Amino acid sequence: MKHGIYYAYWEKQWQADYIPYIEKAAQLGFDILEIAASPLPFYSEQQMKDIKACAEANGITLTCGHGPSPDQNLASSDPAVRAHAKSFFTDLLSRLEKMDIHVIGGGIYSYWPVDYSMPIDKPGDWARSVEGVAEMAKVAESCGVDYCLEVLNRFEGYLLNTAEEAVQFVQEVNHPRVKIMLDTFHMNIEEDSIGGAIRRAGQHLGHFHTGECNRRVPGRGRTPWREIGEALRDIGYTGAVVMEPFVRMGGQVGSDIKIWREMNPGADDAQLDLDAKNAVTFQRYMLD
């Protein structure tokens, strides 16, 4: 396995130039830096080659996370949205190829954050989501990207909340590029069993997020790390393990992640960096 970290660990806003964070992951000992997809549609052809070059220069592979906008909801009962959602993802995946990224994961069968001020039709949206993700699988294949559907706690998604639901979903999609993505934070809320969830996913497992129950760095929480590493080894998982910690109050990040308390009472960015350095040292040692 390769071990990574989401960039938003350092940001207070959902937006940054990624090159500084590629360098930062290298100095702190990561193999992967995971980036958000939102700026990629607005990159120059040269801008994509800038980032691909710097990534390769540092020995770091890039992964991609994305929480779709409401305008990007492949499940929507509005035809015009489903058509645009397909527009966005088709263009996104080709730019992922140009940047030489082979993994995209998130609520990319729905939209994040969900708006529950609306009536929910899960069977209707489910069917539409499967059809639309099936179409996007063809594109993902042509660009060489694994299209990993993230299982989410009930407060952030409604279609895929358990690994069991994810299996039935990707089986109906029925395309090798559509894989399951699991997240220890989301798993900690919905799953009957953590090791059991990982084993249900099995060969369908294409991506893995790590984090503690309250989203601290791995090792500062009650996440069953020993059980997790046993289950990933049982299913021969060789993919990426990307820690997605959120410990900083304030900004749209602190507000979209619902951080309403300081998680590290007055600590400099040098404390966070060592916190990450220590966390990925612990992660490798628990899961490898």
What's the rounded Cα separation, in Å, for the pair 152 and 137?
20
Q: Per CB under 8 A, does 123 bind its own copies?
A: no
Which residue of 204, 207, 209, 216 would you call a contact of its own copies, by CB under 8 A? 216
User: Which residues does 36 contact at the CB level (< 8 Å), separation at least 6?
Assistant: 7, 8, 14, 15, 64, 65, 66
Number of helical (H) and strand (E) elements in the chain, helices listed first? 10, 8
Query: Applying CB under 8 A, which of residues 73, 110, 161, 283 lies at the interface with its own copies?
Result: 161
23 annotated active-site? no
What are the tokens at 163?
């690994």
Contact 242, 210 (CB under 8 A): yes
Contact 249, 259 (CB under 8 A): yes
Residue 72 touching its own copies (CB under 8 A): no
Choosing from 135, 190, 212, 244, the catalytic residue is 244
Stretch that binds Mn ion, among 33-41, 139-147, 193-201, 208-216 (CB under 5 A): 208-216
- State how beta strands 205-210 and 2-6 pair: unpaired
User: Shortest approach of its own copies to residue 154 CB, angstroms?
Assistant: 4
Nearest residue (CB) to its own copies, 113 versus 176? 113
Residue 221 engages its own copies in binding (rule: CB under 8 A): yes
Nearer residue to its own copies within complex by CB, 122 or 138: 122
Task: Closer to its own copies by CB, 124 or 144: give it.
Answer: 124
Catalytic residue, candidates 11, 135, 150, 191 = 150
3-state SS class at 178: strand
**Min CB(244)–Mn ion separation in Å:** 5
Residue reference for tokens 């937006």: 15
Choose, by CB under 8 A, the member of 183, 190, 244, 275 that binds its own copies. 190
3-state helix, strand, coil in the chain (%, to 5): 50, 15, 40
244 is annotated as an active-site residue:
yes
Q: Is 261 in the site for its own copies (CB under 8 A)?
A: yes
- Size, binding site for Mn ion by CB under 5 A: 3
Among its own copies, Mn ion, none, what binds residue 159 when CB lies within 5 to 8 Å by partner kind?
its own copies
Cα–Cα distance list, 63 to 33, 96, 108, 118 (Å): 6, 9, 14, 32
Residue matched to tokens 């350092």: 10
Q: Which residues are catalytic?
A: 150, 244
- The residues that touch Mn ion, with contacts defined as CB under 5 A, are 183, 209, 244
Residues that bind its own copies (CB under 8 A): 115-117, 120, 122, 153-156, 158-159, 161-162, 165, 188-194, 213-214, 216, 220-222, 255, 257-261
